[PDB]
mmCIF file with all atom_site columns, C-alpha atoms in Angstrom:
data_model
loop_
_atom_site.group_PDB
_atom_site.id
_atom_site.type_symbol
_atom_site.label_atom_id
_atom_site.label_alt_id
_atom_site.label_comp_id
_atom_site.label_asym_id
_atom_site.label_entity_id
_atom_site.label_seq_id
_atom_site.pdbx_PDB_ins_code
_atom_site.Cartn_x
_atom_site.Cartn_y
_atom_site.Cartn_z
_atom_site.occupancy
_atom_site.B_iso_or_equiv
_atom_site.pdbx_formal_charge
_atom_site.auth_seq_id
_atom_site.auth_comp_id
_atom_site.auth_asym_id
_atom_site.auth_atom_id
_atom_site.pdbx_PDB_model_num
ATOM 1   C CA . UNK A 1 1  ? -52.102 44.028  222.921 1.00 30.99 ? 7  UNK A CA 1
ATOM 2   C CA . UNK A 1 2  ? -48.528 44.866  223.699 1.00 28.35 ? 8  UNK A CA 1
ATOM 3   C CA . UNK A 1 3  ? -46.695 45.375  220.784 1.00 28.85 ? 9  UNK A CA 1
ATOM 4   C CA . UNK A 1 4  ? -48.965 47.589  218.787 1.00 27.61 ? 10 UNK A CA 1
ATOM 5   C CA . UNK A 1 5  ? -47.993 50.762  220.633 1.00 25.26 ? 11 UNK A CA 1
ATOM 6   C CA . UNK A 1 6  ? -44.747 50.632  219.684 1.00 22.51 ? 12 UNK A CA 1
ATOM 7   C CA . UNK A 1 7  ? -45.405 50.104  216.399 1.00 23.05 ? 13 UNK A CA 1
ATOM 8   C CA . UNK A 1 8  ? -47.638 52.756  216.225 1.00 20.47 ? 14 UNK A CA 1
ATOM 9   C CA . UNK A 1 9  ? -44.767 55.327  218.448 1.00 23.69 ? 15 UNK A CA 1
ATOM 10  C CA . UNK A 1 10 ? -42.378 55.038  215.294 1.00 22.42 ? 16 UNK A CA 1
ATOM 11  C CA . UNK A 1 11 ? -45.002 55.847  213.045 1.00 20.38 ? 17 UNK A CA 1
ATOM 12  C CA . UNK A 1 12 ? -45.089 59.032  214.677 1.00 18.94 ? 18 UNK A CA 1
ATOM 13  C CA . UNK A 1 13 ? -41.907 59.374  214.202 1.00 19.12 ? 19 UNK A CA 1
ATOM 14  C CA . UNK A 1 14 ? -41.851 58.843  211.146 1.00 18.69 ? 20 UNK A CA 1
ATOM 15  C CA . UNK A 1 15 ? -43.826 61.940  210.532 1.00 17.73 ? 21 UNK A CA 1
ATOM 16  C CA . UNK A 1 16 ? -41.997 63.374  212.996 1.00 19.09 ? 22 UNK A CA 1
ATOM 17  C CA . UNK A 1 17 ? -39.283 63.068  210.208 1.00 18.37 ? 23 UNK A CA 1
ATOM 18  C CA . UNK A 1 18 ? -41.851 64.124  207.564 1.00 18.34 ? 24 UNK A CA 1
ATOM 19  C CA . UNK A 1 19 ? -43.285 67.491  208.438 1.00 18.52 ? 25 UNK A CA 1
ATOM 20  C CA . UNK A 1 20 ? -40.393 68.370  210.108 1.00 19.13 ? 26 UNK A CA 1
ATOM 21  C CA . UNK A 1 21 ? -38.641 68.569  206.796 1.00 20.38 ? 27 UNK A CA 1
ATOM 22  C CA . UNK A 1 22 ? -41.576 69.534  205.391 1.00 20.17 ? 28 UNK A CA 1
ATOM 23  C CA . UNK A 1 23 ? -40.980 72.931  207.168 1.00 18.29 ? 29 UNK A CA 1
ATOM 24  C CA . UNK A 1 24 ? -38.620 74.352  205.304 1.00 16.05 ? 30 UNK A CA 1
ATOM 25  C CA . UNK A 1 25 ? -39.665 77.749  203.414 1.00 14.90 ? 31 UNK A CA 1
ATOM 26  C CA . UNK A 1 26 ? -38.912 76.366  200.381 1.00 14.53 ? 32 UNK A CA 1
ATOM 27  C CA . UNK A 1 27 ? -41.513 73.753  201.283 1.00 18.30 ? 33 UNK A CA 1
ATOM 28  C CA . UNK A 1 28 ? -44.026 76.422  202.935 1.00 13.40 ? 34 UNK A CA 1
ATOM 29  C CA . UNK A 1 29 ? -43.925 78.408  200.241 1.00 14.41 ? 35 UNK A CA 1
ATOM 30  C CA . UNK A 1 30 ? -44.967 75.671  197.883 1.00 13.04 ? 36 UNK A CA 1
ATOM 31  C CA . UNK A 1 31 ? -47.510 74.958  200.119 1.00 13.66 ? 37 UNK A CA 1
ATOM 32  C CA . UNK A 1 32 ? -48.385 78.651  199.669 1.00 14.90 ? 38 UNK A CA 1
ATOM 33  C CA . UNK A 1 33 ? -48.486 78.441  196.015 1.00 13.99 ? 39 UNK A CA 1
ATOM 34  C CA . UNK A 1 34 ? -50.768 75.467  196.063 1.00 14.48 ? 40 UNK A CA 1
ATOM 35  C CA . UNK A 1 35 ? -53.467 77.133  198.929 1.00 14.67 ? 41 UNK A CA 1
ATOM 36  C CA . UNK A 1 36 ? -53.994 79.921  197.010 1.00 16.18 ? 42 UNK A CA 1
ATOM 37  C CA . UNK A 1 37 ? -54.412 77.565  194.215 1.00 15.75 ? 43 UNK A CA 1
ATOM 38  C CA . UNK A 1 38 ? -56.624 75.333  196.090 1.00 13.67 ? 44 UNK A CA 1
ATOM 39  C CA . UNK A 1 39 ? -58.699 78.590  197.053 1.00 11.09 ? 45 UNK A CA 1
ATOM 40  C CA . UNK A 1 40 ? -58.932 79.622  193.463 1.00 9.32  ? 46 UNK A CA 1
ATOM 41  C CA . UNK A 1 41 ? -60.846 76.873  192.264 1.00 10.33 ? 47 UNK A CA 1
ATOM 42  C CA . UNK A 1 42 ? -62.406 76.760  195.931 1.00 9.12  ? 48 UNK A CA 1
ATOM 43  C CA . UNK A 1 43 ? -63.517 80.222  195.465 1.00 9.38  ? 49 UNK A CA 1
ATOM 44  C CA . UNK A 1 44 ? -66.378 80.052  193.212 1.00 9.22  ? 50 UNK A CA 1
ATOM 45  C CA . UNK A 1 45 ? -67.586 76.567  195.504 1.00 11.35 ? 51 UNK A CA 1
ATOM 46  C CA . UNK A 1 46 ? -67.150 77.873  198.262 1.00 12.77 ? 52 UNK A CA 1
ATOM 47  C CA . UNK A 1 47 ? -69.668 79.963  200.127 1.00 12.67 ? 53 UNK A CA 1
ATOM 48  C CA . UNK A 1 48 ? -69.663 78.933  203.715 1.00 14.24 ? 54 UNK A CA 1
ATOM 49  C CA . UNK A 1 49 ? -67.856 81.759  206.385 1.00 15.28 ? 55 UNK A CA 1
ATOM 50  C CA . UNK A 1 50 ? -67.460 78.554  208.805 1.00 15.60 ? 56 UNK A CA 1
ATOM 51  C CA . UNK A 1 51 ? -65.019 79.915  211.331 1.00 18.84 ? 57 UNK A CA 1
ATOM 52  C CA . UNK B 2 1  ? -70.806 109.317 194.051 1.00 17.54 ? 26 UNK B CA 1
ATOM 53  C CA . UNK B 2 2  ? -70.894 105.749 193.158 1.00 15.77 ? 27 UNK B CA 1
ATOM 54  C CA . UNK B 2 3  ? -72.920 102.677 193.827 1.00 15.30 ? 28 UNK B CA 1
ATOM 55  C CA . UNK B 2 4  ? -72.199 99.264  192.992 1.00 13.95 ? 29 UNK B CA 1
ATOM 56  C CA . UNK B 2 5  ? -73.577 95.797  194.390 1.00 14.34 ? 30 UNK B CA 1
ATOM 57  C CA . UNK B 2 6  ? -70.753 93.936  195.310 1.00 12.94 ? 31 UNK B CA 1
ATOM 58  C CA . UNK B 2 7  ? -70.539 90.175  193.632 1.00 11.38 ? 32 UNK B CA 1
ATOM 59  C CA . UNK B 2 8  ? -69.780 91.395  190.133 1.00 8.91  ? 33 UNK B CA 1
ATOM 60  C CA . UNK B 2 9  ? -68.631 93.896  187.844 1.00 7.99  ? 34 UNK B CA 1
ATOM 61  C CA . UNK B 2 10 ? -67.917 91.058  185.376 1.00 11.36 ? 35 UNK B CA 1
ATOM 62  C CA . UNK B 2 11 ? -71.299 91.782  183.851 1.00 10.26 ? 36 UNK B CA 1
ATOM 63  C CA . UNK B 2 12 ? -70.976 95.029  185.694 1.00 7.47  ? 37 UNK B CA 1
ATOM 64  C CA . UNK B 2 13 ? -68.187 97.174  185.113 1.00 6.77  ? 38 UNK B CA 1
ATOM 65  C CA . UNK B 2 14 ? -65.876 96.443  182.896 1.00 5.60  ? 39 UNK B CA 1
ATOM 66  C CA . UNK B 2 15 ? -65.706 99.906  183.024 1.00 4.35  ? 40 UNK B CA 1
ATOM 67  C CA . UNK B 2 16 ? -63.099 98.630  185.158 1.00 5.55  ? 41 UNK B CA 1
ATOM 68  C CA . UNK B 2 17 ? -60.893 96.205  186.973 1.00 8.57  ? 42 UNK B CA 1
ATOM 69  C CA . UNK B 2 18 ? -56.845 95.091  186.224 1.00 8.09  ? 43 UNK B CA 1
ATOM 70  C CA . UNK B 2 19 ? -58.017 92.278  183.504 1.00 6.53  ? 44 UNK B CA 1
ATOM 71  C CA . UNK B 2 20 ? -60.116 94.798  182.144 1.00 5.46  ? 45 UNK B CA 1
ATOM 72  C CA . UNK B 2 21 ? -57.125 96.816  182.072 1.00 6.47  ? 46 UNK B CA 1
ATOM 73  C CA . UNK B 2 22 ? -55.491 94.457  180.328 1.00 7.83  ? 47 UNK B CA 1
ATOM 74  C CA . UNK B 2 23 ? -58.502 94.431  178.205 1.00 5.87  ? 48 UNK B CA 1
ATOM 75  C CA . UNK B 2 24 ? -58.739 90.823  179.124 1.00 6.84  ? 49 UNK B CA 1
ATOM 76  C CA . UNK B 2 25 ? -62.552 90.841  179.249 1.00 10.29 ? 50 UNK B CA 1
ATOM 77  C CA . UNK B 2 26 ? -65.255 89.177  180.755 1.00 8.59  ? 51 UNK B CA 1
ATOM 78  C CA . UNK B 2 27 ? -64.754 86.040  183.493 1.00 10.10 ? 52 UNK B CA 1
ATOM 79  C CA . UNK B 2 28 ? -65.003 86.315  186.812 1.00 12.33 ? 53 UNK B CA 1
ATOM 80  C CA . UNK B 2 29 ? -61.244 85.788  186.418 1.00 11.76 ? 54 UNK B CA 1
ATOM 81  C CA . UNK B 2 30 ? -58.514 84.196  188.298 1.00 12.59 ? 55 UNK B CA 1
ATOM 82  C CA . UNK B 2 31 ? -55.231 85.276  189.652 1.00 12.79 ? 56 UNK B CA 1
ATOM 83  C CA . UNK B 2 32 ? -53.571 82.008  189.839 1.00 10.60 ? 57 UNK B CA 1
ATOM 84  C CA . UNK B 2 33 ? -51.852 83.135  193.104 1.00 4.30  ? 58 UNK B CA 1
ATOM 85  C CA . UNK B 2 34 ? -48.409 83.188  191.781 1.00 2.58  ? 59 UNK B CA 1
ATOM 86  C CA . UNK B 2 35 ? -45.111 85.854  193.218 1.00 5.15  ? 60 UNK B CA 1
ATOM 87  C CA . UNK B 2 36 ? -43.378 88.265  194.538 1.00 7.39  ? 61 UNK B CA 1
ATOM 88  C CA . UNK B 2 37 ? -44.099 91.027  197.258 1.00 4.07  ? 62 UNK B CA 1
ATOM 89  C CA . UNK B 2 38 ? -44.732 94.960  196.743 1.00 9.02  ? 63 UNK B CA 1
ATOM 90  C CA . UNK B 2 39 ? -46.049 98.634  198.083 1.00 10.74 ? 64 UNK B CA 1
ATOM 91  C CA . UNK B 2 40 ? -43.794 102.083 197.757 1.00 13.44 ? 65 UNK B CA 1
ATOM 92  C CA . UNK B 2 41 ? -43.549 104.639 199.632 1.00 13.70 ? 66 UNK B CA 1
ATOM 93  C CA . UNK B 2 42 ? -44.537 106.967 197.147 1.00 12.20 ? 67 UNK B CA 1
ATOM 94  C CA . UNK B 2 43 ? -46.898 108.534 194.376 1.00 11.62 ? 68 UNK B CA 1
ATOM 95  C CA . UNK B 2 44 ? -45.680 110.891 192.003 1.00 13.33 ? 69 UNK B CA 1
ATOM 96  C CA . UNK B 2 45 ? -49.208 112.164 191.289 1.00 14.24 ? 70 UNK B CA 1
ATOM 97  C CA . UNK B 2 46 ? -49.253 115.462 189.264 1.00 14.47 ? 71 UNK B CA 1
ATOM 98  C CA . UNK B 2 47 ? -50.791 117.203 192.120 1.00 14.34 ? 72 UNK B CA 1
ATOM 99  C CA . UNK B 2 48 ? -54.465 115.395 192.839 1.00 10.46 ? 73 UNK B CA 1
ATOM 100 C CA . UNK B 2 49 ? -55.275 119.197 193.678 1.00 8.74  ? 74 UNK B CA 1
ATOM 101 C CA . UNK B 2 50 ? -53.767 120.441 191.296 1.00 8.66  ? 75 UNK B CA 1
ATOM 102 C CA . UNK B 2 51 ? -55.683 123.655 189.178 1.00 8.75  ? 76 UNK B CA 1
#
């Protein structure tokens, strides 16, 4: 029962490291390029206005 | 003036639109995403009333 949380607390971490570098414009921006992507193809799918 | 029902004009009015412009014709058309930010400031219209 005991060790487990400490394993998990570094996994946290360990996207601590992630998104933290995963901010970085250069990043976002890719990010960007895929959502409108991800949209395009959504676009036609999708129909729902859920908020 | 005019009247349109909004969901296509790609099967109603290409008599229209940028791909139509480019004489690209007929889909329902993507814009991939992809670039780089614009506006003006500015028109250089002839005069829109003009005569």
């Amino acid at each position: 029962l005991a060790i487990d949380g400490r394993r998990m607390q570094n996994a946290v971490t360990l996207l601590r490291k992630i998104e933290m570098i995963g901010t970085t414009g250069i990043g976002a921006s890719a990010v960007h390029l895929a959502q409108s992507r991800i949209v395009d193809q959504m676009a036609g799918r999708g129909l729902i206005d859920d908020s | 003036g005019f009247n349109l029902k909004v969901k296509d004009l790609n099967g109603s009015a290409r008599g229209l639109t940028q791909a139509f412009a480019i004489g690209e014709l007929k889909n329902q058309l993507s814009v991939g995403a992809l670039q780089l930010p614009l506006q003006f400031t500015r028109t250089f219209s002839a005069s829109m009333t003009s005569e």
